[PDB]
């Protein structure tokens, strides 16, 4: 079958809904900055892992690379940015995002918004990105809605 996946990225709020049900929601004012990553089972849509990496801060990108490298091929990966995710998103992490098929991830800039849904090992199912227009501003909120094919037993 399919999963209906909805992913939202903005300055102050992220959420992810799967089949109309909210599995992640973070609207807290000064918490949860960075790249939120959700891993779903590719047959059932069950949440395997939920992490946030504050890649505005040093060393979090290194943690994210270790984490993503251990995700099994075939898992569904969902990424979404809250506030800022680029400042300490360094070349190794960007290369990894590129390997996953992301076009916007490797190009992520200051206060850009970004939502991504893909299968580890490819293909990418959907991706949206809004560039911040100025250093004192954030990218526009992005709402990505995409259908994800499920694998069958
Ligand atoms: O002049 N500067 O280098 C500079 C000026 C203002 C800045 O604001 C910060 O930006 C972070 C990323 O958006 C927010 O998480 C944080 O809460 C705060 O708003 C950061 C840097």
Author numbering: 97 to 249
Copy text from the publication:
Here, selenomethionine derivatization and mercury soaking have been investigated for SFX experiments using the high-energy XFEL at the SPring-8 Angstrom Compact Free-Electron Laser (SACLA), Hyogo, Japan. Three successful cases are reported of single-wavelength anomalous diffraction (SAD) phasing using X-rays of less than 1 Å wavelength with reasonable numbers of diffraction patterns (13 000, 60 000 and 11 000). We succeeded in experimental phasing using SeMet-derivatization and Hg-soaking techniques at wavelengths of 0.954 and 0.984 Å, respectively. Such high-energy X-rays, which are essential for Se-SAD, allowed us to collect data at high resolution (1.4–1.6 Å) and perform SAD phasing with 11 000–60 000 indexed patterns.
SeMet-labeled Stem (the stem domain of human POMGnT1) crystallizes in the space group P21212. Diffraction data from SeMet-Stem were collected at a wavelength of 0.954 Å (13.0 keV). There are two monomers in the asymmetric unit and each polypeptide consists of 164 amino acid residues, of which three methionine residues were replaced with SeMet (Bijvoet ratio ≃ 3.7%). Out of 91 437 collected images, 35 295 (38.6%) were selected using the Cheetah pipeline adapted for SACLA. Of these images, 26 583 (75.3%) patterns were indexed and integrated using the CrystFEL suite, with sensor geometry refined by geoptimiser. At least 13 000 patterns (a mean multiplicity of 74.3 at 1.4 Å resolution) were required for SAD phase determination. The localization of Se sites required 13 000 patterns. From 13 000 patterns, we identified the positions of three Se atoms in the asymmetric unit using SHELXD as CCall of 9.21% and CCweak of 5.42%. When the correct hand was used in SHELXE, a mean FOM of 0.649 was obtained, and 285 residues were modeled with CC = 42.5%. The electron-density map for the correct hand was readily interpretable.
